[PDB]
Design an enzyme around this catalytic site. Structure first.
Site, PDB file in Angstrom:
ATOM      1  N   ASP A  16       0.967  -1.232   0.146  1.00 62.41           N
ATOM      2  CA  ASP A  16      -0.063   0.059   0.120  1.00 62.41           C
ATOM      3  C   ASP A  16       0.828   1.394   0.018  1.00 62.41           C
ATOM      4  OD1 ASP A  16       0.993   0.187   2.601  1.00 62.41           O
ATOM      5  OD2 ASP A  16      -0.891   0.304   3.591  1.00 62.41           O
ATOM      6  N   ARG A  30       0.937   7.020  -0.262  1.00 62.45           N
ATOM      7  CA  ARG A  30      -0.178   5.941   0.396  1.00 62.45           C
ATOM      8  C   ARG A  30      -0.989   5.866  -0.663  1.00 62.45           C
ATOM      9  NH1 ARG A  30      -3.701   2.587   1.524  1.00 62.45           N
ATOM     10  NH2 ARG A  30      -3.945   2.055   3.888  1.00 62.45           N
ATOM     11  N   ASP A  35      -6.901  -1.002   1.506  1.00 66.40           N
ATOM     12  CA  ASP A  35      -6.312  -1.565   2.385  1.00 66.40           C
ATOM     13  C   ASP A  35      -5.620  -2.800   2.038  1.00 66.40           C
ATOM     14  OD1 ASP A  35      -6.979   0.521   4.511  1.00 66.40           O
ATOM     15  OD2 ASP A  35      -8.910  -0.100   4.555  1.00 66.40           O
ATOM     16  N   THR A  36      -4.464  -2.967   1.880  1.00 71.76           N
ATOM     17  CA  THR A  36      -3.784  -4.325   1.745  1.00 71.76           C
ATOM     18  C   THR A  36      -3.428  -5.002   3.094  1.00 71.76           C
ATOM     19  OG1 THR A  36      -1.716  -3.234   1.589  1.00 71.76           O
ATOM     20  CG2 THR A  36      -2.792  -3.643  -0.482  1.00 71.76           C
ATOM     21  N   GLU A  38      -0.503  -6.219   5.365  1.00 68.10           N
ATOM     22  CA  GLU A  38       0.709  -5.398   5.220  1.00 68.10           C
ATOM     23  C   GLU A  38       1.823  -6.583   5.810  1.00 68.10           C
ATOM     24  OE1 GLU A  38       0.626  -1.469   7.180  1.00 68.10           O
ATOM     25  OE2 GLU A  38      -1.569  -1.941   7.545  1.00 68.10           O
ATOM     26  N   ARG A  82       2.838  11.471   4.206  1.00 69.02           N
ATOM     27  CA  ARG A  82       2.475  10.539   2.873  1.00 69.02           C
ATOM     28  C   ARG A  82       1.399  11.193   1.953  1.00 69.02           C
ATOM     29  NH1 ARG A  82       1.237   4.563   4.946  1.00 69.02           N
ATOM     30  NH2 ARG A  82      -0.227   5.853   6.027  1.00 69.02           N
TER      31      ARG A  82
END
Length: 136
Positions: A16, A30, A35-36, A38, A82
Site C-alpha cells: 500500500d 500511500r 487496505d492491503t 501489510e 505521506r
C-alpha cells in the site's frame, strides 16, 4: 478536474506504499482507498497475503515505463507526511489492480477523497464473486 502528473519510482515499500520522486523531491505515497494486508503492520506485522500484495505492487511499478500520480479532491497528505494518491503504471491504476485481484479491500472512505470509490467497489465485488486470494 483531476489530472495525472508524472513521477519516478524510487522504491516500493509495501503493498500500500511506494516512495516516488515527485516534482524533484523524494516522497512517500500511500495508495488511496485501499487496505492491503501489510508486511509492515504497526501491531500485527506480517499478515496473510501481505507478501503477495507487496510483491504485486512492486512488480507493477518496477516494470512500468511511465508512472503517474493522481490526487483526489481533498487533503493530499496524511498525518504522517505521506502523499494520498491514485498511482498509475503505464496507464493502469495500481489501486484498482490490487482490488481486482483480491489482494486488497476497499478502505473506510473519508469524504471528499472518494472520487474513484464506486469503480473500486465494482472491482472489489467482482473479486469476491470470483473468490480470489483474500476472498478465497
Amino acid at each position: 478536474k483531476l489530472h495525472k502528473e508524472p513521477a519516478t519510482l524510487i522504491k516500493a515499500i509495501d503493498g500500500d506504499t511506494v516512495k516516488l520522486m515527485y516534482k524533484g523531491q523524494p516522497m512517500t505515497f500511500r495508495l488511496l482507498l485501499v487496505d492491503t494486508p501489510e508486511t509492515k503492520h504497526p501491531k500485527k506485522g506480517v499478515e496473510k497475503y501481505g507478501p503477495e500484495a507487496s510483491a504485486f505492487t512492486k512488480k507493477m511499478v518496477e516494470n512500468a515505463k511511465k508512472i503517474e500520480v493522481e490526487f483526489d479532491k481533498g487533503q493530499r497528505t496524511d498525518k504522517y507526511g505521506r502523499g494520498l494518491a491514485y498511482i498509475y503504471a503505464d496507464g493502469k491504476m495500481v489501486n484498482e489492480a490490487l482490488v481486482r485481484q483480491g489482494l486488497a479491500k476497499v478502505a473506510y472512505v473519508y469524504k471528499p477523497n472518494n472520487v474513484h470509490e464506486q469503480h473500486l467497489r465494482k472491482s472489489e465485488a467482482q473479486a469476491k464473486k470470483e473468490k480470489l486470494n483474500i476472498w478465497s
